[PDB]
């Protein structure tokens, strides 16, 4: 009963979260996950500012209203060489990664580690925050509030 949450640097408060290293988060679970980080799904404007500060990924994730990939450098296999906040238009499927926005983060690039899930609630899941440098913080808890997600 274990969940790995892979987290990135924050850029103007925005970061990327991947559950168990594969696209596996519903829109409802994404909201709950950011909430556990005392964060919200970013708005498009928040994501655009994060991009301008140096945020890019190669993964689809939820923001408020859309599923996107922020791109700085054109790469053929990441949003098909697009740059900017690339918006997913056509897909059959409902599960992706998520982005989250923490208003308390630093204004620009913050590539320090994440060492807590400050707003998770009581629960039986071993939840592990995994940073890109491999540093880990684990706690027993839960964040999912929708039955269909568990
Ligand atoms: N599915 C591709 C995953 C790529 N990510 C990139 C971001 C990241 C952050 C923390 C731990 C692992 C990882 C691996």
From Swiss-Prot:
Function: Cell-surface receptor that plays a role in cell-cell interactions, cell adhesion and migration, helping them to sense and respond to changes in the tissue microenvironment. Participates thereby in a wide variety of cellular functions including the activation, recirculation and homing of T-lymphocytes, hematopoiesis, inflammation and response to bacterial infection.
Species the sequence originates in: Mus musculus (Mouse)
Carbohydrate-modified residues: 6, 38, 81, 92, 102
UniProt gene name: Cd44
All copies of domain Link, residue ranges: 13-102
Protein name (Swiss-Prot/TrEMBL): CD44 antigen
Reported tissue expression: Expressed in the intestinal epithelium.
Disulfide bonds: 9-111, 34-100, 58-78
Posttranslational modification: N-glycosylated. O-glycosylated; contains chondroitin sulfate glycans which can be more or less sulfated.
Quaternary state and interactors: Interacts with PKN2. Interacts with TIAM1 and TIAM2. Interacts with HA, as well as other glycosaminoglycans, collagen, laminin, and fibronectin via its N-terminal segment. Interacts with UNC119. Interacts with PDPN (via extracellular domain); this interaction is required for PDPN-mediated directional migration and regulation of lamellipodia extension/stabilization during cell spreading and migration. Interacts with RDX, EZR and MSN (via FERM domain). Interacts with EGFR. Interacts with CD74; this complex is essential for the MIF-induced signaling cascade that results in B cell survival.
Binding-site residues for hyaluronan, renumbered to this chain: 22, 59-60, 86
Subcellular location: Cell membrane; Cell projection, Microvillus; Secreted
Recorded domain comment: The lectin-like LINK domain is responsible for hyaluronan binding.
């Amino acid at each position: 009963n274990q969940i790995d949450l892979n987290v990135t640097c924050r850029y103007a408060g925005v970061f990327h979260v991947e559950k168990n290293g594969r696209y596996s988060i519903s829109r409802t679970e994404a909201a709950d996950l950011c909430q556990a980080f005392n964060s919200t799904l970013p708005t498009m404007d928040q994501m655009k500012l994060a991009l301008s500060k140096g945020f890019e990924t190669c993964r689809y994730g939820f923001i408020e209203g859309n599923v996107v990939i922020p791109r700085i450098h054109p790469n053929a296999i990441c949003a098909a060489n697009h740059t900017g906040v690339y918006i997913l238009v056509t897909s059959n499927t409902s599960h992706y990664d998520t982005y989250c926005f923490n208003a308390s983060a630093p204004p620009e690039e913050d590539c320090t580690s994440v060492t807590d899930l400050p707003n998770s609630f009581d629960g039986p899941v071993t939840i592990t925050i995994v940073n890109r440098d491999g540093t880990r913080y684990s706690k027993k808890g839960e964040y999912r509030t929708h039955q269909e997600d568990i």
